[PDB]
Structure 1
């Protein structure tokens, strides 16, 4: 029982940490750079106006 738990946890923890790191180093960086770009291009429209 401890071993089946150990094996399942060692996969599930790796899966979870991989999703967390993908959020931290893929999804949040895309969002942050996208927000900074939007702020920039909104200010470009504001300067044209």
Structure 2
């Protein structure tokens, strides 16, 4: 049981660290980029209507 438990805890902790460090920030950056792009298009539409 000691050996098996060591293995399982190791794998789960490794997966948690990976998800925390190299998954969430990537998606957050993607979301921010898309959010900026939407406003970028909105500005051009506004300018056309103004003209």
TM-score class, shorter-chain normalisation, is 0.7 to 0.9
- Cα displacement string for residues 1-49 of structure 1 (whole angstroms, at most 9, x for unaligned residues): xxxx111111111111111111111111111111111111111111121
Q: Please list every run of 5 or more consecutive structure 1 residues that lacks an aligned counterpart in the other structure.
A: none
* RMSD of aligned Cα (Å): 1.0
The runs of 5 or more residues in structure 2 that have no matched partner are 46-51
Q: Which has the larger radius of gyration?
A: 2
Q: Could you tell me the TM-score, scaled by structure 1's length? A: 0.76
What TM-score, normalized by structure 2, do the two folds share?
0.74
